[PDB]
Amino acid sequence: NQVSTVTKVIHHELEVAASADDIWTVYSWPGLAKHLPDLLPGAFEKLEIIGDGGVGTILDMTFVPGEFPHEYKEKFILVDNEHRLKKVQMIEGGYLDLGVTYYMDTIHVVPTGKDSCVIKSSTEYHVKPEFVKIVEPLITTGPLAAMADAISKLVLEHKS
Numbered sequence: 732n733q734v735s736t737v738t739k740v741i742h743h744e745l746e747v748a749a750s751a752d753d754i755w756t757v758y759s760w761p762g763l764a765k766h767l768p769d770l771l772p773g774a775f776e777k778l779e780i781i782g783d784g785g786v787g788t789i790l791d792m793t794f795v796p797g798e799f800p801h802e803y804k805e806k807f808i809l810v811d812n813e814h815r816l817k818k819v820q821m822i823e824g825g826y827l828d829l830g831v832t833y834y835m836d837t838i839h840v841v842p843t844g845k846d847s848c849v850i851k852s853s854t855e856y857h858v859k860p861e862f863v864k865i866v867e868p869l870i871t872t873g874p875l876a877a878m879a880d881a882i883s884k885l886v887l888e889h890k891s
């Protein structure tokens with residue numbers, strides 16, 4: 732037969748003193764992609780956007796030297812305004828070159844009051860069992876936390 736692939740999930744939250752709608756509005760903004768290096772000081776050696784920024788857009792990203800991974804492409808695969816849920820898939824390169832067969836980020840912006848919310852970020856991946864110990868330490872909440880940190884700051888400042 733084949734040995735089962737292994738599934739791993741990691742999770743990150745950031746509480747934010749702004750409406751779920753204000754935060755959701757930036758995460759789902761088709762204009763965000765182009766602005767990513769404005770939101771992340773460096774990190775990008777290169778960023779090519781294929782598509783209009785909306786769902787179906789492919790981002791091809793090269794990272795400054797050292798940074799693992801160095802290169803990968805990501806695709807915006809779902810926007811759900813009713814749930815404030817967005818999904819972004821890693822589609823080529825990156826961890827897919829280290830025995831990972833599926834890598835999906837989900838962001839869910841959840842109201843905590845009239846004027847507060849929590850950004851729930853998760854990554855789910857499927858990995859060949861002999862590669863689990865290799866990738867386990869490489870795949871972290873770092874990138875989701877960095878996205879939530881930048882968007883949180885942008886929105887709180889746009890309204891202070």
Ligand SMILES: C[C@@H](CNCCc1ccc(O)c(O)c1)c1ccccc1
Nearest residue numbers: 758759760763764774819874877878
């Ligand atoms: C590329 C990002 C994480 N993925 C970001 C995907 C995305 C694009 C456009 C969006 O409007 C959005 O909500 C998510 C990243 C961060 C730090 C370090 C490395 C990568």
